[PDB]
Design a protein around this motif. Structure first.
Motif, PDB file in Angstrom:
ATOM      1  N   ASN A 153      -2.392  14.878  -0.827  1.00 44.00           N
ATOM      2  CA  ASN A 153      -2.590  14.898  -2.275  1.00 44.00           C
ATOM      3  C   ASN A 153      -1.599  15.748  -3.062  1.00 44.00           C
ATOM      4  N   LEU A 198     -10.708  15.859  -4.863  1.00 44.89           N
ATOM      5  CA  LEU A 198     -11.998  16.070  -5.565  1.00 44.89           C
ATOM      6  C   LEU A 198     -12.661  14.723  -5.791  1.00 44.89           C
ATOM      7  N   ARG A 232      -7.344   9.376 -11.089  1.00 46.15           N
ATOM      8  CA  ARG A 232      -6.080   9.646 -11.762  1.00 46.15           C
ATOM      9  C   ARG A 232      -5.938   8.539 -12.765  1.00 46.15           C
TER      10      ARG A 232
HETATM   11 CL   LIG Z   1      -8.026  14.564  -6.491  1.00 44.40          CL
END
Ligand SMILES: [Cl-]
Ligand SMILES: *Cc1c(COP(=O)(O)O)cnc(C)c1O
Ligand SMILES: *Cc1c(COP(=O)(O)O)cnc(C)c1O
Ligand SMILES: [Cl-]
Lengths: 304, 302
Positions: free
Chosen positions: B7, A268, A34
């Motif tokens: 998340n 991910l 991020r």
């Molecule tokens: Cl992620």
């Protein structure tokens, strides 16, 4: 107001996410994808440049040259584009086309070196370039530039400390340049005085140079699949004295764990992220680690 | 502390970055690729799921069913895996193979639908699978589930308002589901009362259905290359009444502007992000826009 004057200033403040199905509920993953350019490297891409500007070596007229083309090269290209610097990236001709198209889209000037010579060639080909015109060229060098661990000491570390309200017991970092491990540890063990923090370095079982180094054995690297870590030597930005434990991970453990991160947690993650989390799992097999909060860096989204 | 329980809770709080070469210095780009799954869709993937849970229709053992041909399915896959839900995605056979491979790789059960029927056929099929066993299946339909614009009214909008200290004068959003445009506008013009905010919808010149609809004309869509926007119909989540201006962008303008973002600003932008910024450039050709602060959504990365 909160308006960033350019994309380089948006680095960091990455989220710390509790893993619920991988590990005992105490593994806290820091998602470095991020970030601009999708990896932890944006922090050093930004700070090495800001640091060079502050030192007066980078300015109008000076231009960048880097052997990098992996996550650091991409990071340097976006910062260069955002801040107005010419950038020349040398890289073994083996790199994927999309990889070079991306770097070129960012405005970087690409110089391909003999594929067989690998990265050793690009590294040579870059020092050749800067040596050719020392005043016109600036080679940053992520493996030894202090601005690398410095940004982690000033951002990554504080973020970990504040997000856990100081409740971080173990800190796990797969080592590439070593800057993340070094800077975060200096901030938590040093600046915050939490000397009982356990700092864990992660490396490929097939190229365990940190374990070799720490054991006083000869440095003997080997080929591995964990992209991003295991450079085959001890970087200047890795302070071996700050390491409490070294965990070796296999290519298979890294890959399988990265897959678990997407399937079981919806995160991910790249292969080195899988390796770092695999190290956390290994430690949790040891009863002394059972109730400790483990913070683990997930360096990138992978490439996929 | 600030430890996210999963998340999905990490969505939003994306950066607003001033564009320095592109435009006059007043274009502020909101980077939605700084979200899990790298697009603005994670906001709705997460809120539709959170909303269904709050409504009591989504419960452990309940499988999600959603029609998709793009980013929403991808985001739903991340969110589903994070909160422990199985997911089925219906998508038309027009969808590329790589896209199918990616979605399956992310864990979704793929149901291909009649190519001739497009998205309409995929939503149709989703409803049918649900109706086939409504206790087992929950439909998450991004074009009409109000939880889509709701999340934008509750996060994206407030972020824009706080980050500009209320100084935003124009808001530009390329429309796909229309949720971003609708929610952000409701927050700023509605909750904050700034009625003179100029809300701009962006669409492909080759499929100008919003301009058509607002002109009282017959809706006639067309093929275009601005992925992510221009669904070819008016989504239930697009409140046409909130739109002050519609700007049509060509494929070439979108692509070249996305390239400018990367090279001149170091911002990795997808084609629809280039389209949105190209619309800002077009507005600044007009003297009435010269001193206005323009906030533009950059939906995803390249
Ligand atoms: Cl992620
Ligand atoms: C750079 C990097 C690392 C290691 O980080 P260092 O701070 O250099 O130790 C790990 N994984 C990936 C993918 C990286 O790019
Ligand atoms: C979803 C999306 C948009 C449009 O956003 P809405 O809120 O659905 O109108 C634009 N570009 C891309 C790439 C998207 O995924
Ligand atoms: Cl970006």
């Amino acid at each position: 107001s909160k308006i960033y004057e350019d994309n380089s200033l948006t680095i960091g403040h990455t989220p710390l996410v509790r893993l619920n199905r991988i590990g005992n509920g105490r593994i806290l993953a820091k998602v470095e994808s991020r970030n601009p350019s999708f990896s932890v490297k944006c922090r050093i891409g930004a700070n090495m440049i800001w640091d060079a500007e502050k030192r007066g070596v980078l300015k109008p007229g000076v231009e960048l040259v880097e052997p990098t083309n992996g996550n650091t090269g991409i990071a340097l290209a976006y910062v260069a584009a955002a801040r107005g610097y010419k950038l020349t990236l040398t890289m073994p001709e083996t790199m994927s086309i999309e990889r070079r198209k991306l770097l070129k889209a960012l405005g970087a000037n690409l110089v391909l070196t003999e594929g067989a010579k690998g990265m050793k060639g690009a590294i040579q080909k870059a020092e050749e370039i800067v040596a050719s015109d020392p005043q016109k060229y600036l080679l940053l060098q992520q493996f030894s530039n202090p601005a690398n661990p410095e940004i982690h000491e000033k951002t990554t570390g504080p973020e970990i400390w504040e997000d856990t309200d100081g409740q971080v017991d173990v800190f796990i970092s797969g080592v590439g340049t070593g800057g993340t491990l070094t800077g975060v540890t200096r901030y938590i063990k040093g600046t915050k005085g939490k000397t009982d923090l356990i700092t864990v370095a992660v490396e490929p079982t097939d190229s365990p140079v940190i374990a070799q180094a720490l054991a006083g054995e000869e440095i003997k690297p080997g080929p591995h699949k964990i992209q991003g870590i295991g450079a085959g030597f001890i970087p200047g930005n890795l302070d071996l004295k700050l390491i409490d434990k070294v965990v070796g991970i296999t290519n298979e453990e890294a890959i399988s764990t990265a897959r678990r991160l997407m399937e079981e947690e919806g995160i991910l993650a790249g292969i080195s992220s899988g390796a770092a989390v695999a190290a956390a799992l290994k430690l949790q097999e040891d009863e002394s680690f059972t109730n400790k909060n483990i913070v683990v860096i997930l360096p990138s989204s992978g490439e996929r």
